[PDB]
Amino acid sequence: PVDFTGYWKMLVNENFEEYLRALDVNVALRKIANLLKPDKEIVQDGDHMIIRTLSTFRNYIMDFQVGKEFEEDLTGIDDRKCMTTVSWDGDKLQCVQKGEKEGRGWTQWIEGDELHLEMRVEGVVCKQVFKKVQHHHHHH
Numbered sequence: 001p002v003d004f005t006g007y008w009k010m011l012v013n014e015n016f017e018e019y020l021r022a023l024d025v026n027v028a029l030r031k032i033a034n035l036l037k038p039d040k041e042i043v044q045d046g047d048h049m050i051i052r053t054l055s056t057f058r059n060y061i062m063d064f065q066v067g068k069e070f071e072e073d074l075t076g077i078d079d080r081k082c083m084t085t086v087s088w089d090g091d092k093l094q095c096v097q098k099g100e101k102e103g104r105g106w107t108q109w110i111e112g113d114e115l116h117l118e119m120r121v122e123g124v125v126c127k128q129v130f131k132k133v134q135h136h137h138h139h140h
């Protein structure tokens with residue numbers, strides 16, 4: 001049984017600016033956003049999952065039930081909202097973000113001490129890897 005609970009620090013973030021360009025994020029904000037190295041704080045509580053992407057620039061909080069479609073407010077990212085469903089696919093977590101953009105979603109999984117996150121839109125792929133960490137810090 002896969003359990004994503006933990007605190008995770010960004011190690012790599014590959015091709016994020018092109019992913020943001022495919023979302024039509026303005027160039028100045030793409031530059032700002034790709035300098036950020038947010039942590040992830042995840043609590044998996046039965047089928048209720050909370051994924052907190054944490055940085056001093058901004059926190060983005062996902063709070064959902066696996067298998068239940070919900071309205072995801074991404075307006076601070078790319079001025080859009082999606083109808084999002086997160087589901088198990090073997091040992092991976094699959095997210096489909098239905099909306100104006102084609103093929104928008106992500107896939108998350110664990111390898112050893114690494115949290116792997118692949119995000120996609122319009123055929124453009126960004127890959128992030130985080131390392132599991134144990135020193136915790138307070139966030140709001």
Ligand SMILES: C=C(C)[C@@H]1CCC(C)=C[C@H]1c1c(O)cc(O)cc1CCCCC
Nearest residue numbers: 025033034036038053055058059060077
């Ligand atoms: C909430 C944030 C820290 C920022 C907010 C601004 C943008 C354009 C992207 C987010 C971002 C970022 O700059 C780096 C990331 O690794 C992840 C995310 C969250 C949104 C991901 C989907 C675009």
